[PDB]
Subunit: 149 residues, 4 copies
């Protein structure tokens, strides 16, 4: 069967897809490494979730990876759930500025913050939090989520 593709993992990917869309819709998604870093540096207290996205090429972009080292360390230090994802383009397609793209749709970092408008408390958030708990409990500290696709 497909590598890494369990029900747990299938569910995590679907939840993330949903969370990215609802977060975007509710205006509580931050897109971009520098935009994300600035929020984490200024006021991190409302970020519920972080996604780091790097393609195979991005693995040898030392600057990008060093930024990842910093964001990830910060997230761990501040108990913010964080997953890695290996398809940058798909991430961009799901969020704002996808579907075609003059100058590549390439976001390497997303923060999802709490909307509290009296808003929707997406259960997708909860499932993903559980997923990351499930990873820690098996000593996978930097968990990845695969395309259910």
């Amino acid at each position: 069967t497909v590598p890494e593709s369990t029900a747990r993992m299938q569910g995590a990917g679907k939840a993330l897809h949903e969370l990215l869309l609802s977060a975007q819709r509710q205006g509580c998604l931050t897109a971009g490494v520098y935009e994300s870093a600035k929020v984490l540096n200024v006021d991190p207290d409302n970020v519920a979730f972080c996604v780091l996205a790097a393609g195979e090429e991005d693995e040898g972009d030392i600057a990008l990876q060093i930024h990842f080292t910093l964001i990830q360390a910060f997230c761990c230090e501040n108990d913010i759930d964080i997953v890695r994802v290996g398809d940058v383009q798909r991430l961009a397609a799901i969020v704002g500025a996808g579907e075609e793209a003059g100058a590549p749709g390439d976001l390497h970092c997303i923060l999802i913050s709490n909307p509290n408008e009296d808003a929707w408390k997406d259960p997708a958030l909860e499932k993903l939090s559980l997923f990351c708990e499930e990873s820690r409990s098996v000593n996978d500290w930097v968990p990845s989520i695969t395309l259910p696709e």
Copy 2:
């Protein structure tokens, strides 16, 4: 029941166990971050495998993590298979000197073939540096 516990994952764990043991029954096996980094800087054309190992304790060790980052970026650049292990003590049960990084250098070995396939299968689903659960 039990996150990440696949047949594939299990065969991966055993294979890394075997591989680690094959080295240590030979020179190989450069141990530690600073040791390994020079090896990569000096002679990376001969290195076949890398294992980064860290516990939850080490997530706020920015020095160690920056090095994990530089090691990982290099291996990926230079097509060395590389893997994360999360249980530093269980790794220590297989080998001494503690031990956050292991290089395997100048191979057929069912274990090495198998792990090599494991890593390509991870790449298939965009997991460029996958985690391995050691057995016991």
Copy 3:
């Protein structure tokens, strides 16, 4: 008497004072580390000058320092003149928003010509990113 207090250094300080003032009497002048880093990532063909500023307080700010490192390496790669200033408050007396990095973008200006010569003269003696002492 007074370390680093050369005629050349003095003319450098005044020229940076003037340059900073010329911008702020214009768009230019991207302020701050995260701001500047995107600018460099996005459109570095238009950036003419960088100033990293930090105090003794900031030497153990590894986040800030890693960014100083990435900014500096980029500028050198891409031939943007870049300079270190050691008095963050005295820098603040010239410009608001506090402020560890300043980009100047899309120039003749005696100050900019002069600083451009200053930086080449630093390179002459292998000082790739020199310090400037602001006057007052």
Copy 4:
């Protein structure tokens, strides 16, 4: 006159030259970034001085510079005097493995540790320490030493 070339600076460069030679001779010089890092990580308590050396090319070697960020931060945090120097080859020529070089003589980091054999207390060390004090007092935190040459 030559940029940066004051008596203070002329003296600093000569002192450093001397310190590199005496340290080498007394077997209390550590050569290399990884060798240096390991000493600083294991037991830093006997290192008196650090030299970081990078040529113009080295300025765009992100890995090297990140190592520099770490060594330098550590040195500042632990009050070890540290200077930067911009001629790697000359540094190598002065220390071991210079004068010709099969596979370039390229050391990017030197630590000088206390010899105490009942040994020579090089005054060059003292002058350089003073030099670095003189730099701090003028808000030049990462001081450089130029070739008197």
